[PDB]
Amino acid sequence: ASTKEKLITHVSKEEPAGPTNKVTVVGVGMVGMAAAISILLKDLTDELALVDVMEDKLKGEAMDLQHGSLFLKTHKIVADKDYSVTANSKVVVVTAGARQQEGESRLNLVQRNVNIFKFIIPNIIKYSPNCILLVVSNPVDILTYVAWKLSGLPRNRVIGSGTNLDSARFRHLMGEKLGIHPSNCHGWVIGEHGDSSVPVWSGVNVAGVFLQGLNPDMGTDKDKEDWKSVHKMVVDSAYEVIKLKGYTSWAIGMSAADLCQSILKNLRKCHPVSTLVKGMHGVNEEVFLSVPCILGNSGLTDVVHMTLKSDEEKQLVKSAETLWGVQKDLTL
Amino acid sequence: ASTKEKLITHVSKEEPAGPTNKVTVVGVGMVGMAAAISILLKDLTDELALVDVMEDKLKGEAMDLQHGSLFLKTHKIVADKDYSVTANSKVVVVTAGARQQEGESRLNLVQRNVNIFKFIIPNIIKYSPNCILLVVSNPVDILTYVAWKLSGLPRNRVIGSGTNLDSARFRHLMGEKLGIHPSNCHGWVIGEHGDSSVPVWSGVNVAGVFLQGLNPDMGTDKDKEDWKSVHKMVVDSAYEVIKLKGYTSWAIGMSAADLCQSILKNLRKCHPVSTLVKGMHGVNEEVFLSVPCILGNSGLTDVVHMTLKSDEEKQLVKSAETLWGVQKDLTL
């Protein structure tokens, strides 16, 4: 009899229950790992699954993480090239994508990514049919649409990180300017993720007091404080970070973990995420854009309809036309 | 027309998924509420259900907790006299019991408790057939056995709090004695909860260093440092708190929340809990006593076999015999 057989005795004759809040992260590059590390440290999952085509790198990250088990409240951390390791996941974060190339059209980049998703997505759904897909891959808005198409899942179970982090970045800068914690500064950045995103000036407030009211010119050329530059810094953040260190990851990881917390714990919290906006704000095309949504364990179950100005609804309609412009040329 | 309707639009077609880690607490006395506040403050559940026999108190406690929602990460808190409110619980903490009466025999008291359980246990199982029962009511060892028989549940899903807190109290006292945090002081109190519990001196250590190795007289009459007084302080703990403030609640509440976390998060952690021990250390009847067990989302799946001194086993057998003697005279 081994030490284990002499020390521990199995007394259950019932089949093991299986994970309750399993999370899978596709792509263990810096973004994937930042999300994984954030999810582990915040004790959100009872089982973390990792997958990536680069086998050695995947095995090393998983191994590195498993060695810290003593400091975590996660039952197990699994990794493998075969997607069967992701079975029964509640949430699957997709960070994988195509490595851009030399002067390659945007339609070709997107199509390259689509081809990558044609493998990934169907393999994810085979082992976790009741999951919720959280797409982080860029371009996020269109790629979320692709994931939604290829998966066959209802809209509530396919979400894009959208402008979740850009709104957090806005609140942070707003916080540094006012001298108060970002969680007390309210502001929303919606629309298309990137340079075309929309800062909704009418909602910027502290304790329910809107700053636009105190400065009606806020966000325009007539602004004596140039708030427009704050949103400009939000869109140029990733670029600035990359110019300084080559990649961007920590902020995105905390944002993804934040989204997973609301999903896993069924919080029903409002987050600006990418979802189907067809029929909203004059948008009639089948595109995904960021708007405030309610997240829980059933996914994106509710969408907030914002009171937007003609100029704002217009920017959204324009972004939607650009996305659809690429989407209608794709082969799914 | 509604303000809600104009602001929020439900976009899901799927029926809501339901709770993933629901917890029910039976009895809203001091012990039950302490457990409830401990489970909520530690973000262990997405839905807490409370049930008791008094409508107003039950409703008052729920309302008080609900008013604190802003500070919690629990989707909802519900309470009712009807057990249907506890549907789909993963863990059900049972604290309900009969108030003691002077001049009463031990048998009457235990039967009174059984009478209560005959109404309660089947109600729980009807709505949560796949739950894990955590019995905290006293006498915990006999009452856990009763819940096991009445529930019809397999042994791995019926657990008694047993000596979990008494071991924690022992580690706390040991800690105060050596000047270090209780999590670094290791010691186990097993067997029958209370006066007849057994402190396993051979396991008492810090960083793996046997304290009995440094003082072989430890725990005996020859013991010059009188460690026996530490174990006597443990068993007398409830009594002392009771005659100072009137009852005990906080330590038990923290203790139950600790057990729930191991179970809800499938930690497979070792806890000294009450479980069936027939066939161990000489016990030959179906009785529940405390021994180190491994707990997860499948319940109590493994038991650790400690190597005990024939003397230590003798106390366990005497206890078993005392417990069996009472069980045969009960009316289920």
Added chain:
Amino acid sequence: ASTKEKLITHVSKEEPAGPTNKVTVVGVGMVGMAAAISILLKDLTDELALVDVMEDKLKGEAMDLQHGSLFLKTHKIVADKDYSVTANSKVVVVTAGARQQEGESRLNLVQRNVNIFKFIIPNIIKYSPNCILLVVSNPVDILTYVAWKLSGLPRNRVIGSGTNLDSARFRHLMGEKLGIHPSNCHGWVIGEHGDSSVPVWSGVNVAGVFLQGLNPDMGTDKDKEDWKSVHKMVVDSAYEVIKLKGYTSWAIGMSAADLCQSILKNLRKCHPVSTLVKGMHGVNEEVFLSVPCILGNSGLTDVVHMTLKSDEEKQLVKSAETLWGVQKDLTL
């Protein structure tokens, strides 16, 4: 010779550093203990001190909490009738007060409380001259003013719980109404704590969307959705819980712990707390009312100036006048 001596050797030459975030709770009634259990379960302090006038109860509560040390991350929990036990506290939560008496005038009740504070306040300051006083006792607005005068402390270090919980209750009710988490529902209840508090309808929003924008009649007689009943439910909350369970405690405890966290962790977060408002919204006397303030380790360092409707300010002035009327008749 000692077992301790052979096992552990003290190797420091320096005297121990003392606590860095010590918290004291004055009064161990239901409210005080709820605050104590909330502060400990959320790992906010390295040393918790309890003080009250009854030796046995005080000692019983401390012992109960100490028995749960294994499950906590607080170095020590101490309790005594002598205020020297509260030395070097960063935050002192004051909940002590006079039990009400039927047929009693408002003035007698408040004076009775002042009589209590004249003994308590100087004792606290003698041992913790650099603490931040958090007054929770009712009537909080007048009693915070009294603590300020008696303490001799600068305004930034004397805070009243004010409408912090009532605003949380409002966000909770709003949340239940719209079907989303209270942290996503924004609304502020300011002014005099209780019946005369003011709900600032202009600030009520979700994701920055003015609900008053969608329903301008919100809060008035023309209001078809009767939002006024939500604010009336807030003010009637304590009363309802009181006649159901006998007292309130949990929500207040969570509320105080929330305020302590902002202060202990220097978050500079916005909270609706009671502070000196002379010179704001027309108030001309030294009275404390609730308004949004920024809290950190330096205390209440900044106050937010909400743009209120002349009608809203009128209620604040009426309150100020009612409060001043009572303060001039008090004997400090």
Added chain:
Amino acid sequence: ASTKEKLITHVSKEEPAGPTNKVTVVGVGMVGMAAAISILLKDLTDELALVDVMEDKLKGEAMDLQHGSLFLKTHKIVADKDYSVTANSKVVVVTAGARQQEGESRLNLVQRNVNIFKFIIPNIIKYSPNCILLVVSNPVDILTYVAWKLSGLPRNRVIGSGTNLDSARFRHLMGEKLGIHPSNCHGWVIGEHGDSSVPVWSGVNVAGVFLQGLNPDMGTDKDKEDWKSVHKMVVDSAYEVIKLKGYTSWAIGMSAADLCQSILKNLRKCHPVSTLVKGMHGVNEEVFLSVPCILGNSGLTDVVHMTLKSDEEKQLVKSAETLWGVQKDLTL
């Protein structure tokens, strides 16, 4: 008047208090960042300071981290090439070091590191004289000694990560073998960090039951289970991870954060860390080796004296001679 001057009013006339639990991380390479990220996610500090000679990389990491402020409870995150930014730190984690070279003697590598520390250490002590230095740089044992010499701080305030992580790795593997959480598997790896470390077989236990007792041959050639290979995997872990992904970081980061938690919160917890062992286990040279110690806010205030076998004390004496062999040739 700006929006800020009209919205927020400073009401404090007292000097700001300053950080209470500030932490500085020297070297923002992967190890530094893994530690920083672990410290932030576990809400341990109210101010995180980062420093590194590589200015761009430093600015990018800090920037990346600051953008996630909304998801953290840390007042501020600062970074700079000038050490004045680290003023008033409670704990300073040193990860910086010399980049090894082609067939360079060990004495020269160490001396190169010493030269790096001759700048760093005195700059750290200039701005934070009352801090606690936590050295992670390899070779950790000797480098901790160097830091201690150059700083002039008492031994309780200069600690080396030592075998903290290797013991965690041991407990993890032990856990995977037995099928239980690592926090329930006790085992200690002491001595010199690396291939010469010592696994203390007599302390390996589960619930106080030692495995050596159940298998007296445990750890020797006569072992029928080859436990010696478990310790072999612990020493070869870093290498295996690096062969798979080029670097090692996550496990080390969680371990450092774990150490900082005990220090910052004055937990008085037992950790196997590197400290002055002169006078212990036959060691008479002035060297640092890992042994179980008690950590709190005064630093390493206590050392546990383990009951070790002649063969074990010997390995320690040998390691100490090797370290001293290098140390006596250094120019500090």
